[PDB]
């Protein structure tokens, strides 16, 4: 509903990295060279998203502000690797604005982190917390929640997103220092 300043990002297909790898590289570059000095308005929804085939990211769409894009796209934390993807263009916000509140948050993924929490500041049974981790115990994003991770943990990327309901309503909220929404986002369409 409030996707006035709109932009897109298309990572071109090449044999030097996967589409999820290119999306993770673009997301890490945006999180390092967009919320480096801070900021308020950052909206990064799936501009070419399809959450039915289990693919969380294969296209980028930015719904940000005017001054947030006039000074948030001219740094070396964004440029440099522009030989795979391309630049963007500005577009106005139409009357059709679905309230797709896109966020940048986490989800429950610890199958033994409850035991660490009980040992640190809980005083709970750590053996039952370790043995209480079945396949039907973890409840994370089973839809395409693309987790662009780093080279610190061997475990693969689970869900890290705050998606909203796509309808004909309006829902906007406060953007964080990483390109998300803390109660809503800009439009998507």
């Amino acid at each position: 509903m409030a996707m006035d300043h709109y932009l897109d990002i298309r990572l071109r297909p090449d044999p030097e990295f996967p589409p999820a790898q290119l999306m993770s590289v673009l997301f890490g570059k945006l999180h390092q060279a967009l919320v480096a000095q801070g900021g308020d308005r950052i909206g990064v929804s799936f501009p070419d998203l399809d959450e039915s085939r289990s693919r969380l990211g294969e296209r980028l769409r930015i719904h940000a502000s005017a001054d947030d894009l006039r000074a948030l796209l001219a740094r070396p934390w964004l440029e440099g690797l522009r030989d795979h993807l391309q630049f963007g263009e500005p577009a106005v916000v139409p009357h059709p604005t679905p309230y797709r509140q896109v966020s940048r948050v986490q989800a429950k993924s610890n199958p033994e982190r409850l035991r660490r929490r009980l040992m640190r500041r809980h005083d709970l049974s750590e053996e039952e917390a370790r043995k209480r981790i079945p396949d039907t115990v973890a409840r994370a994003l089973d839809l395409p929640f693309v987790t662009l991770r780093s080279q610190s943990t061997g475990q693969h990327f689970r869900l890290f997103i705050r998606h909203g309901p796509l309808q004909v309503t309006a829902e906007e909220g406060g953007f964080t220092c990483y390109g998300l929404s803390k109660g809503g986002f800009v439009p998507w369409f």
Partner: protein, 293 residues
């Protein structure tokens, strides 16, 4: 006349392994004693390569022999197919030089495509190339791999000098030995990608490294005349021209862009193809491999 039942071409453009080390930027003028990137272990067990605490610059060094004699097979049953192939490749060499294919190989040396995922998001990458005739640099080139593109092919003066050197090496006019150094910029203690073994990272005597067939794949990435789409740029020169990461395969024997079909028509039946398709055929002959039925 028929096809030779056994063909075998020795490869040209024979690279050595990539000895990855690490250092600090603007000390590249004395980058001989830089410490190597050591493969270590952390967590199940994985192998992880990193940078030192006071380092932010990768160094990837290898050498490259350019051989020449790019038409003669190393094993051939027929004596009519063999000299028919020799005179066909001699027609290719005398009507135009190697300078087109060698220009594209010098472009793949000019940028840093032998850096695979240690290039993505780099601040500055410089590809230094020296010419070695004895133990002394006979000609020194310096580049900038982010200025020179990856999906298009352009012109320069030093790139044309390097392409002339590669074209003299591929024809048999001399002996060319080049050493290649690619400095980079990643960050103060970030992660570098070596090549994985059958996880296990590839190594030598206490140094992470890259396989030589990987750098060879990054050098035979030439052909733009798969005419379907230029959004992917160029791909690797190989028959039934295919990408395993893409999973698809263009240049099929469905249409007649195949190496085998073009080679059969241009050697046996004297059907001279377009100039770009014969550039592809001579690039496959420079690649080498096991041919024949």
């Amino acid at each position: 006349l028929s096809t030779a039942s056994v063909l075998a071409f020795e490869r040209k453009l024979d690279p050595s392994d990539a000895l990855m080390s690490a250092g600090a930027w603007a000390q590249r003028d004395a980058s001989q004693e830089w410490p190597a990137v050591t493969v270590r272990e952390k967590s199940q067990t994985v192998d992880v390569a990193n940078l030192p605490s006071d380092a932010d610059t990768l160094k990837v060094r290898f050498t490259l022999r350019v051989l020449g004699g790019a038409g003669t097979p190393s094993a051939c049953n027929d004596a009519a197919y063999r000299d028919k192939l020799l005179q066909t490749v001699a027609t290719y060499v005398n009507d135009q030089g190697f300078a087109e294919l060698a220009r594209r190989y010098a472009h793949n040396l000019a940028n840093a495509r032998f850096l695979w995922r240690n290039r993505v998001g780099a601040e500055a990458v410089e590809v230094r190339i020296n010419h070695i005739r004895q133990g002394e640099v006979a000609r020194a080139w310096r580049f900038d791999a982010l200025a020179i593109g990856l999906r298009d092919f352009k012109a320069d003066a030093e790139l044309d000098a390097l392409a002339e050197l590669i074209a003299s090496g591929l024809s048999g006019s001399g002996h060319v030995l080049l050493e290649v150094v690619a400095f980079a910029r990643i960050g103060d203690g970030q992660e570098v990608f070596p090549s994985q073994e059958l996880k296990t990272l590839y190594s030598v005597r206490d140094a992470a490294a890259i396989h030589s067939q990987k750098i060879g794949n990054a050098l035979r990435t030439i052909d733009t005349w798969y005419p379907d789409e230029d959004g992917l740029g160029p791909i690797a020169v190989e028959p039934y021209g295919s990408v395993t990461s893409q999973g698809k395969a263009y240049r099929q024997p469905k249409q007649k862009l195949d190496f085998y079909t073009l080679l059969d028509n241009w050697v046996l039946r004297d059907e001279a193809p377009a100039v770009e398709q014969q550039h592809y055929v001579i690039a496959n002959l420079i690649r080498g491999g096991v041919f024949g039925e």
